[PDB]
Design a binder for this molecule. Structure first.
Ligand SMILES: O=C(O)[C@H]1C[C@@H]1C(=O)Nc1cc(F)ccc1F
Ligand SMILES: O=C(O)[C@H]1C[C@H]1C(=O)Nc1cc(F)ccc1F
Ligand SMILES: O=C(O)[C@H]1C[C@H]1C(=O)Nc1cc(F)ccc1F
Length: 262
């Protein structure tokens, strides 16, 4: 095991939880992995798959993103920063995708799931792009129960890094769609204490965070340094106590360790 792996392991030991990291450097396509093949609860990081899948639909349904979707009072779940603003109104599939990605809105995510025919339809997209590891099983908010050993709504750091790469840097999506996804991720509001906090301040990043029970604290990011090829980094973290507090600082520190290890 490398120096970076030794430092990640020490970080993990200090934290009291379980840490999963995957970095892909698109320069030589080398990967740095820590518990890169263990399952972790995705929590809101799964929102990237649901949004990408609706993007995929729009490559044939050209005005899909502009379609109004009713927000009903019964639609609202535990955390709806944007959707609660449009109750007895409508938001578009574009606005829903933005709200899900940028504010982590759970009602928004449930609309995206419905648009895909259920959690199976989101998993269908993963399979359509070669990700055989991602599984989405539940809707919001129960997908965040993050129960130790539960395989539902999990993926591995290696799979999610490979997927995020294909979506934002690769050609799993049409160009218009990819660029929309990159824009959306770049404008995330929830990520300042996570991966971004561990990165040289002049790097551009887009990311999606996620949190859940068992103090589960996640972030997935595409990163663009300057004068070197982009990176994708996944940092997943979960803890033994059901009511454990969030540890975004762990993700910041994993990303600092990786950033130094380049
Ligand atoms: O075992 C697995 O995870 C893969 C082979 C199973 C599979 O693709 N199932 C599956 C895929 C989907 F996209 C939706 C529902 C499903 F049950
Ligand atoms: O979905 C795929 O193309 C890969 C996972 C393989 C598969 O057989 N899929 C699959 C299996 C199932 F049992 C149900 C739905 C599915 F899509
Ligand atoms: O965590 C997020 O990204 C936002 C979506 C909100 C959410 O459901 N998270 C969440 C769920 C839980 F069940 C427990 C803790 C949480 F932080």
């Amino acid at each position: 095991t490398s120096a970076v792996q030794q430092k990640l392991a020490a970080l993990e030991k200090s934290s009291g939880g379980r840490l999963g990291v995957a970095l892909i450097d698109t320069a030589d396509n080398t990967q740095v992995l820590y518990r890169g093949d263990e399952r972790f609860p995705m929590c809101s990081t799964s929102k990237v798959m649901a949004a990408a899948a609706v993007l995929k639909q729009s490559e044939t349904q050209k005005q899909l993103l502009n379609q109004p979707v009713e927000i009903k009072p019964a639609d609202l779940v535990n955390y709806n920063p944007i959707a609660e603003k449009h109750v007895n109104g409508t938001m578009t599939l574009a606005e829903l995708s933005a709200a899900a990605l940028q504010y982590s809105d759970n009602t928004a995510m449930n609309k995206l799931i419905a648009q895909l025919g259920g959690p199976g339809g989101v998993t269908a997209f993963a399979r359509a792009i070669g990700d055989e590891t991602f599984r989405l099983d539940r809707t919001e908010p129960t997908l965040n129960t993050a129960i130790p050993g539960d395989p539902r709504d999990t993926t591995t750091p290696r799979a999610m890094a490979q997927t995020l790469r294909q979506l934002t840097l690769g050609h799993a999506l049409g160009e218009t769609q990819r660029a929309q996804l990159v824009t959306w991720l770049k404008g995330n509001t929830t990520g300042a204490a996570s991966i971004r906090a561990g990165l040289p301040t002049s790097w551009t990043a887009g990311d999606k965070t996620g949190s859940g029970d068992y103090g589960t604290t996640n972030d997935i990011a595409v990163i663009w340094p300057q004068g070197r090829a982009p990176l994708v980094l996944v940092t997943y973290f979960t803890q033994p106590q059901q009511n454990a507090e969030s540890r975004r600082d762990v993700l910041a520190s994993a990303a600092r360790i990786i950033a130094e290890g380049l």
